[PDB]
Design a protein around this ligand. Structure first.
Ligand code: 3UK
Length: 390
């Protein structure tokens, strides 16, 4: 194929560079402001990292995290975003698993025993992460994108021993198109608010990629989402699309009036949406679309479609995806009402784990991802979660 760079591709999308992309602490950054900052930061990272070097970002959601992530990709580095409050041994184990060359952490955090840089105290709108003092200020017109095969590993997503899922340019644009375009039909200018953070694959797509992919903007909050905080954000930001999980919508019941004010598309992932929650908000005039995603598949690959959602259901495979149920002998289940393990194949499929044993990599056997989830399929074709396999 043609060598390409995921960041460069996103920067090339023909969206108004003067429109917002990220929101943070009441402020706003446009596509142009972030593009310029990313290129500048890339000139600094290229002095520190070579193509292929791994980077672990133990940071909460912020524009500097999204920009640093994309700056790593710009130079050919392979970044991963993990829980900033990860325990020392957990962060060390992840950095060891991907043999990271660089770890970026919050302020005052201890050192790992790879190179450790810390973010600045005060939560600035754009942080240099001490790169100015380390490698000097940035170059003014940087554009030395490292272009590689679209199927090559571009970044990692970590989910017992941690497993790092490889994601490439191809299957990244794949799961963005399938979900952000074909399922949600996100429009330029849409205000997005994802409560799950960017160290969760769910949140990375919601907050990091979709604003660039679809021309929308996302609210980034580096504090933990207490229902009180979630409320302040809703009131101040008034998002049109809300990415939550079942428990989040349960916690939002007493604030239904405030949520209905702006939210028009409410999505739920992570675990099955109970009928009670779907029906509580349906009577308030809000449809919650339940969809399943998996780190190994990029994002949601099977979901209820807006305007056609049903209670106690995960919907249908997204366009381009194929879903199959297998019995205890690995044989395809052709019938309805028979629960089996769900296999999935499609645009978002990851090319595999970064480091793993043959038994772990076997989850990708045959060109499918074995979710380990028990699913059944009714006559209409809709899937319903039934639990996990033993
Ligand atoms: N990474 C993601 C991106 C987008 C959206 C979700 C994710 C995400 O959750 O990624 P993970 O790798 O952490 O977990 C995947 C596993 O979580 C479970 N699950 C997720 N969503 C649902 C759902 N709607 N209904 C029922 N079960 C669900 C299921 O066991 C699955 O195997």
């Amino acid at each position: 194929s043609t060598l390409a760079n995921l960041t460069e591709v996103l920067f090339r999308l023909d969206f108004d560079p003067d429109t917002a992309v990220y929101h943070y602490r009441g402020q706003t950054l446009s596509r142009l402001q972030c593009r310029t900052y990313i290129l500048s930061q890339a000139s600094q990272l290229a002095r520190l990292l070579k193509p292929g070097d791994r980077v672990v970002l133990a940071l909460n959601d912020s524009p500097s995290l999204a920009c640093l992530f994309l700056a790593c990709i710009a130079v050919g580095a392979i970044p991963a975003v993990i829980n900033p409050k990860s325990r020392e041994q957990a962060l060390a184990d992840i950095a060891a698993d991907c043999q990271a060359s660089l770890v970026v952490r919050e302020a005052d955090a201890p050192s790992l025993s790879p190179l450790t840089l810390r973010a600045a105290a005060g939560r600035p709108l754009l942080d240099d992460f001490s790169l100015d003092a380390l490698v000097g200020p940035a170059d003014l017109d940087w554009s030395a994108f490292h272009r590689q095969d679209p199927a090559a590993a571009c970044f990692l997503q970590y989910t017992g021993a941690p497993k790092g899922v490889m994601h490439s340019l191809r299957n990244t644009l794949g799961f963005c198109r399938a979900f952000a375009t074909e399922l949600l039909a996100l429009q330029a200018g849409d205000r997005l608010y994802s409560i799950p953070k960017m160290f969760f694959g769910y949140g990375m797509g919601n907050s990091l990629f979709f604003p660039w992919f679809s021309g929308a903007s996302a609210l980034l909050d580096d504090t933990w989402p207490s229902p009180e905080r979630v409320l302040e954000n809703l009131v101040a930001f008034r998002p049109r699309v809300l990415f939550g999980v079942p428990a989040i919508y349960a916690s939002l019941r007493p604030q239904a009036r405030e949520l209905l004010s702006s939210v028009r598309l409410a999505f739920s992932a992570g675990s099955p949406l109970p009928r009670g929650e779907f029906e509580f908000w349906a009577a308030h005039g809000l449809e919650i679309c339940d969809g399943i995603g998996a780190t190994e598949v990029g994002h949601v690959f099977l979901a209820n479609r807006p305007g056609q959602a049903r209670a106690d259901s995960t919907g249908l495979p997204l366009p381009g995806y194929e879903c199959r149920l297998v019995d205890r002998e690995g044989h395809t289940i052709e019938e309805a009402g028979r629960q089996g393990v769900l296999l999935v194949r499609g645009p978002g499929l990851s090319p595999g784990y970064w480091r793993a044993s043959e038994e772990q990599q076997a989850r990708f056997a045959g060109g499918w991802y074995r979710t380990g989830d028990l699913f059944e399929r009714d006559e209409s074709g809709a899937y319903r979660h039934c639990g996990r396999e033993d």
